[PDB]
């Protein structure tokens, strides 16, 4: 068992536990029992940004990006109730955890795309009649993506939403209309979707692991510009336990 | 050591006169400008860009934020005859501080 | 004459147009690295997240800066004092986002400039000179260490190192005043006496020597042609300059001895700037300027403001506005 | 960046007129015997 | 204590208001003190797990002595004026405090610096004296005169 | 055109007055007082402990004279726009398109004349010093006497400085 | 009243000192470059203590004669004038540090 | 355009360094 | 202006009885306050919890009321949260916790009264400055 | 294009303690609310109406009296995302 001193500085702190490849088991669900996800960990491995066509009538594609904000990306220590529904399906309801990370990725050409990689208020459900979590279980769900900056954030000219100037003070007699979009900060709240594909199950320990794909919007800089669509792929780990 | 050197003593000592004297005279001219508030306050291109583009930040815009702080926080006590009453809510402040 | 001996002779040769020397062997590559990286970064580096809050600051010309606003931006606060060479980054893009060029430049530069000092000693020794010009240079050098290295060490982050830019310099000064009240620090004050005084004595000496140039030229020619490089006789009358200056003040405030005069000219600004450097270096450990905030109190206990209190109001403006998004807790403890 | 476009010519002339002055003075100094 | 979920509290920048990741992933304190995550201390280490600050330990295991110690140390930060007014430079007079750490560090930086200068002084002089020209250039034997011109 | 005189009132119907910008300030907060100088409304920086916001105080603006004569605005954003203009004094409609105006104040010919002439006056002081020196010291312009006797410049030799007849 | 007292007697005192430089130079037989050099402190004094407030609303905004008072003057010039950004100040800094 | 200007002026200064150092008037002892 | 008996007269209890401090008491209160409290409460704010200050209005709205000598002396013996619901001696200096806050050990009853007196008098002198924080520095 | 925080200042939020939006420090304004009830109240938000605050599970009788005594100081308005995200109801970046 590793300690903080074994791990510190290595990059391992940003990685999710994996399960052995022997873990193709089945974790039984007792529909009379209440369950809990004690730790949900999401480690992103790829960030794709949807390119934005000119003709708008072709197909938009997801291009690969370069991560520039280092090993600061994983969500972890997420916990929440795991409910058994009438139809035998399971629903994870996220209560709390380190469930967001600002991430900046960079596109070819140098454009930086900041996003709040998150599963805040994740509600995720399985197919009906899950008598056991298995390597064919998958969760699909929605989550909230709050504004990348929160209300106190001040832009470089000191304008903000809950604080700051409400005008471009360096241009005292400029016509204000042209600057409205930059002067008036807006707080977005959007939704994201995620799929968790369970690939490994330790039925003995209630541990599962797999891969995930999530989709969400990136930073809109408080309404100053359009966000990009981001697809995030990675691996996840979860420990289930009876509650 | 340095590539170039004095070779003329008279020029050396004249230069020692010239440099600080000229510097002080230049600063004087600038202050004569400030007498009329004819300042070097802004770079207009920077302000246009920054007004339109809230992700654009330089040390110049950072310093303006500092100046704005100085003005608001020091003006009422520094200029008592103006009777500036600046309620707490109008004082420019970053987060927490 | 074997190859190592030949190489050593060339390195320490007093015939090279620019002296190389052993210090130069370190100096040249480090200064070249610092210089090249600095030029490239100043022109073309993308914005840098100096304060580690994913708020990149644009420093380069191509990204909307002019000569005055431009800078190589200090490495990220998330890095702190961590060593961040290129090979510690997953990519150059990462390295640039996080302000790696700053670290490369200031470490190569500090090494280089230290070796420059060493090199001054070294050539002085090869030429049969007295050794202490390098000691004079230690004052600006120590200053560079103070703002590029010591202050970051004390504050725990190169993100608080002086930026490599004009407006960045001003930023550093203003924030320094907010956080340390450097104006009220006697070492900075001694620094100001050092450079004001040095400027004064510079003009003084210049003007006195110029005033007593011995006539060797006609009015249509530069008086400078009256001195010839390597001539054995002095080109001005120090006795006349002394008679003048002595009468300007009183006789015993004037130097008749050129050696002691020139020593004074060396010592004053060097010592002054040493104190300036020590000011920055000790405020690096938060031993700050004099605090007389609310020092004067009347009979009832009313605060009677002094100029120190007005200074404090300005300082508060700087403090509350600086790094407006970087603080979550009420005290700025570094 | 919306710079003032006259800046360009203002800078060019600022560099060129006095530089040229110096160059003239220097070259005719060299050509004197 | 007031009911905040500190693990999920997003600060104004998007970084966690209380907790964030170090560049290598360790869970660390947020705000400017992100620079100080290398810090280790007896009052803090019980909250530390393999991945850094452990959110369960934070939620459940913070003892009063830790709260005390943190309050004390926070209010005795090594910041103070030369006339020993404790606190940030903008603080009012009241607390007569400069940390022993500031005194010791500043004193010994100054001393170390001047002793480096003394080293330059005396090493340069020792070299000059050993070689025989610490009192100046011999007029009849000026080395540079025996040297080829640089150009 | 003159837009007309802005009169600000709060919900209680008190007339409020915008604090005018002093010439010293590139920027200035928007603060409204009553006739007695008591702060009655403002545009807050931090909203979370705001007490004097136009929205809380129900600030309106009515125009008298000028192009907006007879009109009253009550929506906070508009009222605030006009208050912002009101720190500059009387409010005008400007054509900013024709010259592609940038919205930043420039000085008048009074300013430029004054600047140019104070600066030239100051530089010409130096001219006076230089040429006066040249006039009075013409004899030593190329340097001092090669045969300057040390005793003329040393103390006590002459009773009167620089007067050889007083040895 | 002491402020104008000091500023004005100070102005004429500086005039007197430069006249003294000229006078002694003339008696001793040296060129008057020391006086000429002293024109720079006089330009600084006159521009900062006289012209600057004369352009402003009143003497109030001149520098006050005191250590901390002058520090305030510095900080004021940063906050209100952005004086560090001024190329004339920059040239002054080059002259002094140089 | 500004960038080109800034860098050009800078480049001229470096060139000037080169000439001032290597193609200086030789100091000649007399 | 001077430090009059009027200024030095403060509520003794919630019943409206008042007590008049001596100048010596007030100054002692100031010294003791600097000694044991000012590291967190300099100027009547609270550094480790800025939401609660030492303004008399804040003290008056506390539970039980702390805007009088007895309330403050009781607080220095057995501090509670603002609503009176919890005893916080374990994290706040007090006579009850003088073992873990050693500076409270050499404080006597007389001292607690002086400190209380200082806390009540100071806002009568400094007005907004007391508990106002940096805005009023 | 509207600043929603300024807008909310024009509602009852700008007059009273909004149980759905207001930062928890506000509860210091009245006797008995901070920190215990204030915590309970912010934790169990949002509320459709003010008197719903009396339905919080676990409340002692004392606490209900205090609440009833303060209902006039309370209001509710629609939850404003900008005010409740970031954990800003627990710490909105304002100290002294
Ligand atoms: C040629 C021209 C050159 C001119 C350039 C000049 C450069 C040097 C300038 C030096 C000026 C020194 C001024 C001293 C002012 C003074 O009265 O200083 C007063 C202070 C004490 O101030 C008092 O400090 C007190 C501290 O309060 C704190 O402490 C109090 C109890 O002590 C209370 O508890 C209070 O609540 C708490 O806040 C209060 O602030 C008082 O109001 C305040 O008067 O003296 C102290 O700090 C004592 C210890 C520090 C002294 C340092 C002396 C100078 C150091 C450099 C000297 C040369 C170095 C090189 C030599 C080789
Ligand atoms: C001046 C110009 C005059 C002409 C030029 C002279 C050149 C040298 C000047 C020397 C200073 C002369 C004045 C000395 C008076 C003084 O200092 O008086 C101050 C004290 C004595 O006064 C006491 O000073 C104390 C200082 O606080 C200290 O004590 C407090 C109470 O216990 C707290 O514990 C606090 O944390 C702690 O720092 C308190 O304020 C007391 O209330 C007060 O009575 O003298 C002391 O300490 C003794 C100090 C001895 C030297 C200590 C050297 C420390 C090395 C640090 C150098 C680092 C870099 C320096 C940058 C500058
Ligand atoms: C790198 C740091 C640096 C440097 C080197 C300078 C340099 C300068 N500053 Mg700048 N300054 C800086 C940073 C710097 N500044 C910063 C960051 C700010 C904030 C914006 C300022 C704000 C500032 C202001 C507001 C002013 C300056 C001015 C100056 C110039 C002052 C020249 C002078 O010696 O006047 C000294 C004064 C005189 C020479 C007048 C004559 C003095 C007489 C002769 C004294 C005789 C007295 C007699 C002997 C009796 C003594 C009595 C004794 C008991 C005390 C000089 C160019 C001044 C200026 O530009 O003037 C035009 C000015 O007003 N600076
Ligand atoms: C004079 C030659 C010289 C020196 C001293 C340096 C020094 C440095 N380079 Mg630079 N560099 C150079 C030339 C030099 N460079 C050249 C020519 C290039 C182009 C290829 C570069 C390209 C370059 C890049 C791209 C980077 C550096 C970086 C660095 C820093 C880290 C180096 C390191 O980790 O080595 C480790 C040290 C060793 C391998 C030597 C130690 C060996 C001794 C024997 C043992 C230890 C004893 C100790 C050193 C004490 C010696 C004292 C002495 C008096 C005896 C350091 C400031 C990095 C940087 O700036 O980080 C921010 C970085 O990213 N360099
Ligand atoms: C290792 C050095 C050192 C350090 C870190 C300390 C630290 C301290 N001393 Mg101690 N002390 C020391 C040496 C030291 N002292 C020495 C040598 C003496 C004999 C004079 C004393 C006698 C002494 C007494 C009597 C007292 C202290 C006190 C204190 C405390 C308050 C300091 C203060 O307010 O200073 C004020 C700050 C200054 C005076 C700054 C001085 C600046 C100097 C003069 C600059 C000199 C720089 C350099 C050496 C000169 C170079 C010139 C160049 C041309 C070469 C602080 C913990 C006080 C205390 O609290 O005790 C419990 C106290 O009452 N000290
Ligand atoms: C603040 C910086 C500073 C000071 C204090 C200063 C002081 C001095 N400069 C002098 C000289 C010079 N300074 C010169 C170049 C420079 N001088 C510079 C900066 C300064 N020079 C700089 C930066 C330069 C570079 C160009 C030269 C070339 C000279 C001289 O030749 C001369 C000298 O002799 O040096 C050895 C002396 C003039 C004596 C005199 O006029 O008596 C008469 C006294 C009078 C007329 C009273 C003046 C009253 C003043 C103007 C107003 C009142 C001031 C208060 C009394 C004090 C206020 C203090 C507060 C502000 C803290 C004096 C020692
Ligand atoms: C992006 C990557 C960029 C890569 C750049 C790498 C460049 C490498 C190629 C170098 C080619 C030659 C260039 C040097 C020419 C030269 O110096 O000759 C001048 C003399 C002549 O050399 C003399 O040469 C003589 C032979 S001959 O006469 O030249 O034929 C010989 O006899 C004599 O001993 C010798 O000293 O050289 C010397 O004086 C000794 C070496 C001096 C080198 C100084 C380097 C200083 C660098 C400072 C770093 C900071 C600069 C920042 C900007 C201000
Ligand atoms: C109660 C207090 C207890 C004690 C406390 C001690 C405090 C420290 C005291 C310091 C005393 C220093 C004595 C140094 C003597 C010396 O250096 O002689 C070296 C020369 C020799 O003098 C020359 O002397 C010569 C003869 S001989 O060499 O001395 O033998 C002679 O030839 C020549 O004409 C004459 O000029 O003296 C000088 O020429 C310099 C004159 C001015 C002194 C400058 C000192 C350094 C500059 C000041 C530093 C800046 C400070 C402010 C910064 C902003
Ligand atoms: C290892 C290498 C380390 C050094 C490498 C870099 C050295 C560069 C040195 C400057 C060379 C250019 C000098 C030209 C001018 C030149 O050749 O001067 C040569 C001149 C020689 O003087 P003399 O006494 O020989 O001249 C007497 C007669 O000519 C008078 O008419 O030297 C001086 O005048 C010294 C004073 C000016 C020195 C100015 C130095 C300024 C520093 C540079 C500042 C600008 C930088 C801006 C950056 C954007
Ligand atoms: C920091 C470690 C402190 C020291 C030292 C002292 N106090 Fe304190 N005080 C502190 C905190 C964090 C709080 C808030 C406690 C809570 O959660 O309620 C307080 C509170 C008080 C109060 C109540 C304030 C009010 O009701 O408005 C009082 C009256 C008080 N403190 C007084 C006090 C005195 C007299 C002290 C010195 C003996 C003292 N405190 C020390 C933090 C700290
Ligand atoms: C939402 C804006 C409604 C009120 C109109 C703004 C105040 S007035 C406005 O000010 C401009 C300068 O900014 C002028 O260019 C323009 O002529 C004028 O109409
Ligand atoms: C309980 O609480 C006491 C204070 O109430 C402390 O003195 C003690 O140390 C702590 O364990
Ligand atoms: O990083 Mn640059 O500046 Ca030295 O304090 Mn803290 O940190 Mn930030 O705040 Mn203030
Ligand atoms: Cl923080």
Q: Domains in chain I, ordered, with CATH?
A: 1-137 (1.10.760.10)
User: Which token pair is A207?
Assistant: 């541990």
Interfacial E residues in 34-93 facing C (CB < 8 Å) = 34-38, 74, 77-83, 85, 88-93
Q: How far, in Å, CA of F24 to CA of B74, rounded?
A: 13
Q: d(Cα D16, Cα D30) in Å, to the nearest integer?
A: 21
Report yes or no: E1 at the I interface, CB cutoff 8 Å: no
Put simply, the chain I residues between 39 and 68 with a CB less than 8 A from any chain E CB are 39-40, 42-43, 47-48
Distance, CA of C276 to CA of C142 (rounded, Å):
9
Is-contact A77 A39, C-beta < 8 A? Answer: yes
Give Cα F91 distance to the centre of its chain: 20
Query: Rounded to whole angstroms, what are the CA distances from I61 to E78, H10, J25, J30?
Result: 35, 67, 14, 7
Phi-psi region of E8 (alpha: psi -120 to 50; beta: other; left: phi over 0): alpha
Domain boundary among A160, A185, A210: A185
Residue nearest to atom 5 of ligand 13 (CA): C334
Q: Are C292 and B61 in contact (CB under 8 A)?
A: no
Ligand 13 contact via C159 beta carbon (within 6 Å): yes
CA distance B73 to G75: 12
Contact between C163 and C74 (Cβ < 8 Å): yes
From CA J39, how far away is CA J50, in angstroms rounded? 16
Are A51 and A87 found together in one domain?
yes
Question: Using CA atoms, how far apart are residues A70 and C82, in angstroms rounded to an integer?
Answer: 14
Q: Is the CB of B23 under 6 A from ligand 3?
A: yes
In this structure, are residues A7 and A13 in contact, taking their beta carbons and an 8 Å threshold?
Answer: yes
Q: Which residues pair with A110 in a beta bridge?
A: none
Domain F1-106, what architecture? Roll (3.10)
Residues of J in contact with F50 (CB under 8 A): 9, 14
Give strand ranges (E) for D1-33: none
From the CB of C110, is ligand 4 less than 6 Å away? no
The answer to whether J and G touch (≥3 CB pairs < 8 Å) is no
C227 vs B14: CA distance, rounded Å:
12
b/e per residue C203-215 (b: at least 16 CB within 10 A): bbbbbbbbbbbbb
Neighbours of F159 (CB within 10 A): 9
CA distance G45 to G52: 10
Adjacent-strand bridge partners of A138: A197
Q: In sequence order, what DSSP letters do the residues of F64-97 get, joined into one string? A: ESSTTTT-EE-SHHHHHHHHHHHTTSSEE----T
Cβ of E3 within 8 Å of Cβ of J85? The answer is no
For tokens 């393999």, the residue is E50
Using CA positions, which residue lies closest to atom 38 of ligand 8?
C260
Opening angle at CA C309, ends C305 and C310, nearest 5:
105
Picking from C12, C230, C26, C259, the residue whose alpha carbon sits closest to that of residue C125 is C12
Q: Which residue of chain A comes nearest to E27, CA vs CA? A: A13
- Residue I43 CA to chain centroid, in angstroms? 11
**Does residue A205 form part of some domain?**
yes
Question: What CA–CA distance (Å, rounded) separates F94 from F86?
Answer: 15
Mutation choice for A interface testing from J2, J81, J92 by most A CBs within 10 A: J81
Query: What backbone phi and psi angles, to 5 degrees, belong to F53?
Result: -60, 150
Nearest chain I residue (CA) to E86: I39
Residues of C with CB below 8 A from B82's CB? none
Chain A: give the shortest CA distance to residue F143, in Å.
56
Rounded CA-CA distance J57/J35 in Å is 17
Distance CA A144, CA A150 (A): 14
Rounded (5°) CA angle A117-A122-A124: 125
Binding residues of G for chlorophyll a: 9, 89
Would you call I114 helix, strand, or coil by DSSP?
Answer: helix
Q: Whose CA is nearest to atom 4 of ligand 3?
A: G93
Give which of C64, E57, A139, A159 is closest to B58, Cα–Cα. C64
Segments of chain C assigned E as strands: 71-72, 164-165, 287-288
Please tell me if residue E15 touches chain A, with a CB cutoff of 8 Å.
Answer: yes
Closest CA to G61 of F117, F22, F29, A169: F22
Write the DSSP assignment of J9-71 as a string of letters: HTSGGGTSEETTTS-GGGGGGSTT-TTHHHHHHHHT---SSGGGGGG-TT--HHHHHHHHHHG
DSSP, collapsed to helix, strand or coil, labels residue E126 as helix
Give contacts of H 1-30 with B, CB under 8 A.
Answer: 17, 20-21, 24, 27
Q: Is the CB of C179 under 6 A from ligand 13?
A: yes
Q: Tell which residue, C32, C28, C30, C58, has the closest CA to residue C45.
A: C58
Cβ pair H24:E151 closer than 8 A: yes
CB F10 within 8 A of CB F27: no
- Contact (Cβ atoms closer than 8 angstroms) between residue G43 and residue G18: no
CA distance C194 to C268: 6
Q: Strand pairing partners for C287?
A: E80
Yes or no: is domain J1-85 CATH 3.90.550.10? Answer: no
Residues in chain B with CB shorter than 8 Å from the CB of D2 are 44-45, 48-49
Report d(CA C84, CA C90) in Å as an integer.
Answer: 11
Q: Does J1 touch chain B (CB under 8 A)?
A: no
Q: Are residues A30 and A65 in the same domain?
A: yes
Beta bridge partners of A83: A91
Q: Does A180 touch chain J (CB under 8 A)?
A: yes
R_g over Cα of chain J:
13
Residue with tokens 């726009």: F81
Q: In whole angstroms, give the CA distance from residue E87 to residue C292.
A: 13
Neighboring chain E residues of A77 at a CB cutoff of 8 Å:
7, 54-56
With CA atoms as reference, the chain H residue closest to E145 would be H29
Please write down the long-range contacts of I96-101, taking CB distance under 8 Å and 24 or more positions apart. Answer: I100/E65, I100/E68
With CA atoms as reference, report the closest residue to F54 among I74, J3, E24: J3
- Residue E90 — φ and ψ, nearest 5°? -95, 0
A10 burial via Cβ count (<10 Å: 0-12, 13-18, 19+): middle
In three-state form (DSSP H/G/I as H, E/B as E, the rest C), the secondary structure along C191-257 is HHHHHHHHHHHHHHHHHHHHHCEECCCCCCCCHHHHCCCCCCCCCECHHHHHHHHHHHCCHHHCCCC
Same-domain pairing of A63 and A159? no
Would you give the DSSP letter of residue I87? B
Considering only CA atoms, which of C104, A167, A143 is closest in space to residue F80?
Answer: A167
Identify the sign of the CA torsion J44, J47, J50, J51. negative
Q: Taking each helix axis as running N to C, give the angle between helix C186-211 and helix G87-97, from 0 to 180 degrees, rounded to the nearest 10.
A: 80
**Beta-carbon-side half-sphere exposure of residue F30 (alpha carbons within 13 Å):** 28
CA separation for the pair I65, I57 (Å, rounded): 10
Burial of C299 (0-12, 13-18, 19+ CB in 10 A): exposed
**Resolution of the deposited coordinates, in angstroms?**
2.3
State how far residue B20 is from chain C, nearest Cα, in angstroms.
6
* CATH code where residue A87 lies: 2.40.160.30
**Ligand 4: does its nearest atom lie under 6 Å from the Cβ of C28?**
no
Distance from CA of J46 to the nearest CA of F (A): 19
CB-side neighbour CA atoms (13 Å) of D12: 8
- Per the CB < 8 A criterion, the answer to whether J96 and I135 are in contact is yes
Give which of C307, E74, C258, J28 is closest to G64, Cα–Cα: C307
Spell out which residues of chain F touch residue J89, defining contact as CB-CB under 8 Å: none
In three-state form (DSSP H/G/I as H, E/B as E, the rest C), the secondary structure along chain B is CCCCCCCCHHHHHHHHHHHHHHHHHHHHHHHHHHCCCCCCCCCHHHHHHHHHCCCCCCHHHHHHHHHHHHHHHHHHHHCHHHCCCCCHHHCCCCCCC
Cβ-defined contact of C248 to G34 (cutoff 8 Å): yes
Distance, in Å, from the CA atom of E27 to the CA atom of E16, rounded to the nearest integer, reads 10
Q: How far apart are CA E83 and CA E93, in angstroms?
A: 10
Chain F environment of B92 (Cβ under 8 Å): 45
Cα(I85) to centroid(ligand 1), Å: 47
The sign one gets for the Cα dihedral F45, F51, F54, F60 is negative
Which residue owns the Cα nearest ligand 2 atom 21?
A: E83
Q: I134–J96: do the CB atoms touch at under 8 Å?
A: yes
G90 to chain C: closest CA residue: C166
Residues A64, A84 share a domain: yes
Whole-angstrom distance, CA of residue G81 vs CA of residue B39: 6
Gap from E70 CA to chain A (nearest CA, Å)? 21
- Which of E68, E75, E96 is facing I47, going by the closest CB pair? E75
Cβ neighbours for A168, distance < 8 A, ≥ 6 positions apart: A157, A159, A174, A176, A179, A182, A183, B47, B51
F5 assigned binding-site residue: no
| Residue from D5, C57, A223 nearest B50 by CA | C57
CB F87 within 8 Å of CB F32: no
Going by C-alpha positions, the residue among C67, C104, C71 that lies closest to residue C89 is C104
Distance between A152 CA and the closest CA of chain C, angstroms: 8
Question: Would the CB of E43 count as within 6 Å of ligand 2?
Answer: no
**What residues make up the domain containing A175?**
150-185
Q: Tokens standing for C157?
A: 């982050």
The total number of structural domains in chain A stands at 2
Q: In chain I, count of helices (H) and strands (E)?
A: 5, 2
Can you read off the two tokens belonging to residue I4?
């009059």
In this complex, the chains that touch C, judged by 3 or more CB pairs closer than 8 A, are A, B, E, F, G, H, I, J
Q: Count Cβ neighbours within 10 Å for each residue of C240-276 and write b for 16 or more, e otherwise.
A: bbbbbbbbbeeeeebbbeeeebeeebeebbbbbbbbb
Going by alpha carbons, the residue nearest to atom 4 of ligand 13 is C334
End-to-end CA distance of chain F: 83
CA distance J67 to E91: 39
Backbone torsion region of residue I58, taken as left when φ is above 0, otherwise alpha when ψ lies between -120 and 50, otherwise beta? alpha
CB C130 within 8 A of CB E133: yes
C68: which residues sit within 8 A by CB, 6+ positions away? B43, B60, C166, C167, G85
List CB contacts (< 8 A) between A148 and chain E: 14
The Cα–Cα gap between E36 and F44 comes to 34
What's the gap in Å between the CA of A128 and the closest CA on chain B? 47
Q: How far is the CA of B79 from the centre of ligand 13 (A)?
A: 29
Q: How far apart are CA C243 and CA C247, in angstroms?
A: 6
The long-range contacts involving E133-139, CB below 8 angstroms and separated by at least 24 positions, are: E133/C128, E133/C129, E133/C130, E134/C130, E134/C131, E136/C130, E137/C128, E137/C129
Name the region of J26 (left: φ>0; alpha: ψ -120 to 50; beta: rest): alpha
């Amino acid at each position: 068992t590793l300690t903080y001193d074994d791990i510190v500085g290595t990059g391992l702190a940003n990685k999710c536990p994996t399960l052995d490849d022997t873990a193709r088991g089945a974790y039984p669900i007792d529909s009379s029992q209440t369950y809990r996800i004690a730790r949900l960990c999401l480690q992103p491995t790829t960030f794709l940004v949807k390119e934005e066509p000119k003709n708008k009538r072709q197909e938009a594609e997801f291009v690969p990006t370069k991560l520039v904000t280092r090993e600061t990306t994983s969500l972890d220590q997420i916990q929440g109730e795991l409910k058994v529904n009438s139809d035998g399906s399971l629903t994870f309801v996220e209560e709390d955890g380190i469930d967001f990370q600002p991430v900046t990725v960079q596109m070819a050409g140098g454009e930086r795309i900041p996003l709040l990689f998150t599963v805040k208020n994740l509600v995720a459900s399985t197919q009906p009649n899950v008598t056991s979590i298995t390597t064919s279980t998958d969760f699909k769900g929605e989550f909230n993506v709050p504004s990348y900056r929160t209300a106190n954030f001040l832009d470089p000219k000191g304008r903000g939403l809950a604080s700051g100037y409400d005008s471009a003070i360096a241009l005292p007699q400029a016509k204000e209309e042209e600057l409205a979009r930059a002067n008036v900060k807006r707080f977005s709240l959007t939704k994201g979707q995620i799929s968790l594909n369970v690939a490994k199950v330790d039925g003995r320990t209630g541990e599962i692991a797999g891969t995930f794909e999530s989709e969400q919007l990136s930073d809109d800089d408080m309404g100053a510009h359009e966000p990009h669509e981001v697809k995030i792929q990675g691996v996840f780990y979860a420990s289930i336990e009876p509650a | 050591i340095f590539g170039i050197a004095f070779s003329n003593k008279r020029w050396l000592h004249f230069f020692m006169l010239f440099v600080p004297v000229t510097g002080l005279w230049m600063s004087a001219i600038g202050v004569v400008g400030l007498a009329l508030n004819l300042r070097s306050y802004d770079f207009i291109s920077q302000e246009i860009r920054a007004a339109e583009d809230p992700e654009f930040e330089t040390f110049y815009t950072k310093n303006l934020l500092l100046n704005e702080g100085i003005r608001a926080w020091m003006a009422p006590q520094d200029q008592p005859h103006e009777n500036f009453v600046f309620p707490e809510e109008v004082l420019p402040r970053g987060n927490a501080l | 004459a074997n190859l190592w001996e030949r190489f050593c002779n060339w390195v320490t040769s007093t015939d090279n147009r620019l002296y190389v020397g052993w210090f130069g062997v370190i100096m040249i590559p480090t200064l070249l690295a610092a210089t090249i990286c600095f030029v490239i970064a100043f022109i073309a580096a993308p914005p840098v997240d100096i304060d580690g809050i994913r708020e990149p600051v644009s420093g380069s010309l191509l990204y909307g800066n002019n000569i005055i606003t431009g800078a190589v931006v200090p490495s990220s606060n998330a890095i702190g004092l961590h060593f961040y060479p290129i090979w510690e980054a997953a990519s150059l893009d990462e390295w640039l986002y996080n302000g790696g060029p700053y670290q490369l430049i200031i470490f190569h530069f500090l090494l280089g400039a230290s070796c420059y000092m060493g090199r001054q000693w070294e050539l002085s020794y090869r030429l049969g000179m007295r050794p202490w010009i390098c000691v004079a240079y230690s004052a600006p050098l120590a200053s560079a260490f103070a703002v590029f290295l010591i202050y970051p060490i004390g504050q725990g982050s190169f993100s608080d190192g002086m930026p490599l830019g004009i407006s960045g310099t001003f930023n550093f000064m203003i924030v320094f005043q907010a956080e340390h009240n450097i104006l009220m620090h006697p070492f900075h004050q001694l620094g100001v006496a050092g450079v004001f005084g040095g400027a004064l004595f510079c003009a003084m000496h210049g003007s006195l020597v110029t005033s007593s140039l011995i006539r060797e030229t006609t009015e249509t020619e530069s008086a400078n042609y009256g001195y010839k490089f390597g001539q054995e006789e002095e080109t001005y009358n120090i006795v006349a300059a002394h008679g003048y200056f002595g009468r300007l003040i009183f006789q015993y405030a004037s130097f008749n001895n050129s050696r002691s005069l020139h020593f004074f000219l060396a010592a004053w600004p060097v010592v002054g700037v040493w104190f300036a450097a020590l000011g920055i270096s000790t405020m690096a450990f938060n031993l700050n300027g004099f605090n007389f905030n609310h020092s004067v109190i009347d009979a009832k206990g009313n605060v009677i403001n002094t100029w120190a209190d007005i200074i404090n109001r300005a300082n508060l403006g700087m403090e509350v506005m600086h790094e407006r998004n970087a603080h979550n807790f009420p005290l700025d403890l570094a | 960046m919306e710079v003032n476009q006259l800046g360009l010519i203002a800078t060019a002339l600022f560099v060129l007129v006095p530089s040229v002055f110096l160059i003239i003075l220097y070259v005719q100094t060299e050509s004197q015997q | 204590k007031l009911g905040a979920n500190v693990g999920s509290a997003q600060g104004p920048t998007g970084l966690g208001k209380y907790l964030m990741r170090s560049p290598t992933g360790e869970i660390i304190f947020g705000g400017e003190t992100m620079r100080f995550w290398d810090f280790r201390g007896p009052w803090l280490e019980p909250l530390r797990g393999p991945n850094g600050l452990d959110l369960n330990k934070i939620k459940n295991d913070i003892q009063p002595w830790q709260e005390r110690r943190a309050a004390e140390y926070m209010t005795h930060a090594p910041l103070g004026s030369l006339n020993s007014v404790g606190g940030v430079a903008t603080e009012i007079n009241s607390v007569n405090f400069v940390s022993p750490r500031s005194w010791l560090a500043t004193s010994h930086f100054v001393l170390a610096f001047f002793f480096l200068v003394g080293h330059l002084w005396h090493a340069g002089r020792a070299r000059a004296a050993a070689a025989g020209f610490e009192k100046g250039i011999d007029r009849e034997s000026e080395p540079v005169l025996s040297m080829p011109s640089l150009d | 055109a003159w837009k007309g005189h802005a009169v600000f009132r709060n919900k209680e119907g008190e007339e409020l007055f915008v604090r005018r910008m002093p010439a010293f300030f590139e920027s200035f907060p928007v603060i409204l007082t009553d006739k007695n100088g008591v702060v009655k409304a403002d545009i807050p920086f931090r909203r979370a402990e705001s007490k004097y916001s136009f929205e809380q105080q129900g600030v309106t603006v009515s125009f008298y004279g000028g192009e907006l004569n007879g009109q009253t605005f009550t929506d906070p954003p508009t009222v605030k726009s006009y208050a912002r203009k009101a720190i500059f004094g009387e409010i005008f409609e400007f054509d900013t398109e024709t010259l592609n105006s940038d919205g930043i104040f420039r000085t008048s010919p009074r300013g430029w004349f004054t600047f140019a002439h104070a600066v030239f006056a100051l530089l010409f002081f130096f001219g006076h010093i230089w040429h006066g020196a040249r006039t009075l010291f013409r004899d030593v312009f190329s340097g001092i006497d090669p045969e300057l006797s040390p005793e003329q410049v040393e103390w006590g030799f002459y009773q009167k400085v620089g007067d050889v007849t007083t040895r | 009243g002491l402020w104008t007292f000091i500023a004005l007697h100070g102005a004429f005192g500086l005039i007197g000192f430069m006249l003294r430089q000229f006078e002694i130079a003339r008696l001793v037989g040296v060129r008057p470059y020391n006086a000429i050099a002293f024109s720079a402190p006089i330009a600084v004094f006159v521009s900062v203590f006289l012209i600057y407030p004369l352009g402003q609303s009143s003497w109030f905004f001149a520098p006050s004669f005191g250590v901390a008072a002058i520090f305030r003057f510095l900080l004021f010039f940063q906050g209100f004038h952005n004086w560090t950004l001024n190329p004339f100040h920059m040239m002054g800094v080059a002259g002094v540090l140089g | 355009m500004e960038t080109i200007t800034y860098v050009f002026i800078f480049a001229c200064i470096i060139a000037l360094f080169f000439f001032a150092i290597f193609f200086r008037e030789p100091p000649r002892i007399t | 202006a001077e430090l009059t008996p009027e200024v030095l007269t403060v509520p003794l209890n919630s019943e409206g009885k008042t007590i008049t401090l001596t100048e010596k008491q007030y100054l002692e209160g100031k010294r003791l306050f600097q000694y044991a409290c000012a590291s967190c409460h300099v100027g009547g704010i609270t550094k480790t919890n800025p939401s609660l200050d030492l303004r008399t209005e804040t003290l008056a709205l506390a539970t039980p009321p702390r805007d009088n000598i007895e309330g403050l002396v009781d607080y220095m013996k057995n501090p509670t949260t603002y609503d009176g619901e919890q005893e916080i001696a374990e994290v706040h200096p007090s006579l009850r916790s003088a073992d873990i806050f050693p500076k409270m050990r050499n404080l006597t009853e007389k001292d607690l009264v002086a400190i209380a007196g200082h806390i009540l008098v100071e806002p009568k002198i400094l007005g907004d400055k007391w508990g106002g924080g940096k805005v009023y520095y | 294009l509207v600043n929603v925080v300024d807008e909310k200042l024009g509602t009852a939020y700008g007059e009273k303690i909004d149980l759905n939006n207001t930062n928890i420090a506000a509860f210091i304004q009245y006797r008995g609310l901070y920190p215990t009830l204030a915590k309970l109240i912010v934790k169990n938000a949002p509320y459709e109406s003010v008197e719903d605050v009396l339905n919080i599970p676990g409340l002692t009788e004392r606490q209900k009296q205090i609440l009833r005594e303060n209902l006039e100081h309370f209001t509710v308005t629609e939850v404003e995302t900008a005010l409740v995200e970031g954990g800003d109801r627990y710490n909105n970046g304002l100290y002294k």
